[PDB]
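Lecture notes, structural biology module. Today: joint structure prediction for complexes of two components.
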Amino acid sequence: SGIALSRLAQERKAWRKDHPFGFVAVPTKNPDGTMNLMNWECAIPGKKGTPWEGGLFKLRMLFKDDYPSSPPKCKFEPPLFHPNVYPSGTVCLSILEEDKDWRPAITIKQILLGIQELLNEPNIQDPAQAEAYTIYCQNRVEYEKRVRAQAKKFAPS
Amino acid sequence: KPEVTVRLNVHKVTVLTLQDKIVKEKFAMVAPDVQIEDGKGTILISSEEGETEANNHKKLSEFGIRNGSRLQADDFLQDYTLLINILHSEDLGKDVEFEVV
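The predicted structure, tokenised, for the full assembly:
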């Protein structure tokens, strides 16, 4: 637990000193108004020039006591239309899987950039929901319209 | 990693008094974040506005802080971390809010 929290303090400090424009990552508030280092609320801007452009997509990041030996669990809230996002919101990504591409050196910044990258490059070998996967595979112009519509909806204003 | 022990009345000292009079003033931190060492990553005081201000009037005991509790204070603007051991004391007298041992 202490190993996890020491790392999470370092992560928080580095994020505060330098994060990418439009991104948000802050420990969430416990019900008593304290903050919880093991549970962050985050936000990811759609990349420019892509149909995600203008959208801001919120997600939660949960760290376990054996972090950074294990990756955090990441979940969009609300759930998104995207081939690699489960109906629950959970994000399916290989650097987020302990038995695959996760390494302890991976930073929170790298996780959020890796998730942003996933938004515009769906991974067809690892679909997590029926609808976005089917439409992406069968009707790519309809896929792009749903994404654009969704990006419009999550436009902050 | 240096360590200090502070005596105070856990039911009378506010979060704000801990932040401003103890951690900033007495221990010379400029922009401290203070964590309760409960193994849950509880952040009691944040140097970011406006993240923990809503708790400034609350007594330390409202957050489970008691005799023997450990806080970790970490300065955002210096390389400076400090472990604070809490001794609960109800006998400091009318002119004293806290004592460094």
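Point to remember: Residues 105 and 138 of chain A are 38 Å apart (CA to CA).
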